[PDB]
């Protein structure tokens, strides 16, 4: 099997993995994965360098983000 983890790249705030320069995507001043760059609420293709973030996980401007950040959450 492959020996060593020669990468020389920043980790991923999604899977805490060594983002490869080949699939390296700069966004919000960080390095994510072409597969990790997917909303968790709407689960729709996002764009690197034009989205919101909360707790490390990305989220569309709204209502995605909006909801997460609001009073009187879903209940009853
Ligand atoms: Zn990742
Ligand atoms: Zn979304």
Q: Report which bound ligand comes closest to the CA of 53.
A: 2
Q: How far away, in angstroms, is 32 Cα from ligand 2 center? A: 16
Q: How far away, in angstroms, is 51 Cα from ligand 2 center? A: 9
Please count the CA atoms within 13 angstroms of the CA of 70 that sit on its side-chain side: 11
What are the structural domain ranges in the chain?
1-76
Q: Report which bound ligand comes closest to the CA of 59.
A: 2
Q: Which CATH number fits the domain 1-76, given the four candidates 3.30.559.10, 2.60.40.1930, 1.10.10.10, 2.10.110.10?
A: 2.10.110.10
One-letter-per-residue 3-state SS of the chain = CCCCCCCCCCECCCCCCECCCCCEEEECCEEEECCCCECCCCCCECCCCCCEEECCEEECHHHHHHHHCCCCCCCC
Terminal-residue alpha carbon distance, the chain? 53
Technique behind this structure? NMR
């Amino acid at each position: 099997g492959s020996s060593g983890s020669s990468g020389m790249a920043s980790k991923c705030p999604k899977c805490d993995k060594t983002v490869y320069f080949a699939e390296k995507v700069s966004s919000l001043g960080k390095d994510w994965h072409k597969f990790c760059l997917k909303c968790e609420r709407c689960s729709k293709t996002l764009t690197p360098g034009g989205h919101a973030e909360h707790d490390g996980k990305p989220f569309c401007h709204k209502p995605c983000y909006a909801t997460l950040f609001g009073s009187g959450p879903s209940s009853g």
